[PDB]
Amino acid sequence: VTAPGNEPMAIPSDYKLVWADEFNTPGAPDAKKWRYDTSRNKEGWYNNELQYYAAGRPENVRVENGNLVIETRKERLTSMADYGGQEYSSGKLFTQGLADWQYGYVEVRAKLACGKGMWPAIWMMASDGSTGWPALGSIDIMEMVAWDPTTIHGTIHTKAYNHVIHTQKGSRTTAADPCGQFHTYSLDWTKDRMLIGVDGHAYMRFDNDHKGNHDTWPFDSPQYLILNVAIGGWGGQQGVDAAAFPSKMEVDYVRVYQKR
């Protein structure tokens, strides 16, 4: 654990809600809130991932009974022009080009996708990607890899601190039955520090060293939100269990708060 935290977190009293998706409207995700990422479907995704992210496909991404559903399936979507030979479909949504935030408290209430292979994620990347990944700054509010389905991972990545060179700043905790019950996954991002937590408890803290070095604090510019369920890579360490499909992440809401 390279970014340990141990402190409470809660929506600050002096913040207001500035953005939410409550997933109130069944059917397609609200196109004024979310866009689909298809950028690497034909080529194969990063992290040796095994999914095809289907855009506009209710089988993988839909709003039902007040929840977003991102569902993994074992199927070859060979009719898709951007199909890349994948054995699985899934979803990836982001607020890129629609909404982003510099600082804030982000709360996502979600039930995660289980089964060996599954890699549900709730994360952020900087809107200004001119420095490339990883320099632009990424915030993993929640990852879980379903070979270890009770373990919630909270991580940030920067030019200096990232998984490629094993310097990522992260921590972890566990939660009761994360695929069977909702928990709140939360980020408290200020100019001084990030806390990442579950159910009101920060288990991860990453401070701004205030050295003005973009390499170690790229987080004084806006980030957009990403929701996806990857398959394989880190999620596939103990293989991809065909019996687990279909598997779904349900997201009751995303709420963003900022200094009133």
Ligand X SMILES: OC[C@H]1O[C@@H](O[C@H]2[C@H](O)[C@@H](O)[C@H](O)O[C@@H]2CO)[C@H](O)[C@@H](O)[C@@H]1O
Ligand Y SMILES: OC[C@H]1O[C@@H](O[C@H]2[C@H](O)[C@@H](O)[C@H](O[C@@H]3[C@@H](O)[C@@H](O)O[C@H](CO)[C@H]3O)O[C@@H]2CO)[C@H](O)[C@@H](O)[C@@H]1O
Q: Which residues bind ligand X (CB under 6 A)?
A: 47, 140, 143, 153, 155, 163, 166, 168, 170, 234
Site for ligand Y in 141-160 (CB under 6 A): 143, 157
Please say which residue, 107 or 143, places its beta carbon nearer to ligand X: 143
132 binds, among ligand Y, Ca ion, ligand X, none (CB under 5 to 8 A by kind): ligand Y
Q: Cα-atom radius of gyration of the chain, to the nearest Å?
A: 17
State both tokens at 196. Answer: 């990442």
The residue ranges of DSSP E strands in the chain, in sequence order, are: 4-8, 15-21, 35-36, 51-53, 61-64, 67-74, 88-90, 92-94, 104-111, 118-126, 138-143, 151-157, 169-174, 183-189, 193-198, 201-207, 223-231, 247-259
Residue 82 is labelled as binding a ligand: no
- Determine if 38 is a binding residue for ligand Y (CB under 6 A): no
| Beta carbon of residue 232, minimum distance to ligand X (angstroms, whole number) | 11
Residue 66 is labelled as binding a ligand: yes
- Determine if 62 is a binding residue for Ca ion (CB under 5 A): no
Q: What amino acid occupies position 61?
A: V
Beta strand pairing status for 92-94 and 223-231?
A: antiparallel
Q: What amino acid occupies position 179?
A: C
Binding-site residues for Ca(2+), please?
22, 66, 252
Binding-site residues, please?
22, 66, 252
> Applying CB under 5 A, which residues contact Ca ion?
22-23, 66, 252-253
> Applying CB under 6 A, which residues contact ligand Y?
46-47, 119, 121, 123, 132-133, 138, 140, 143, 157, 163, 230
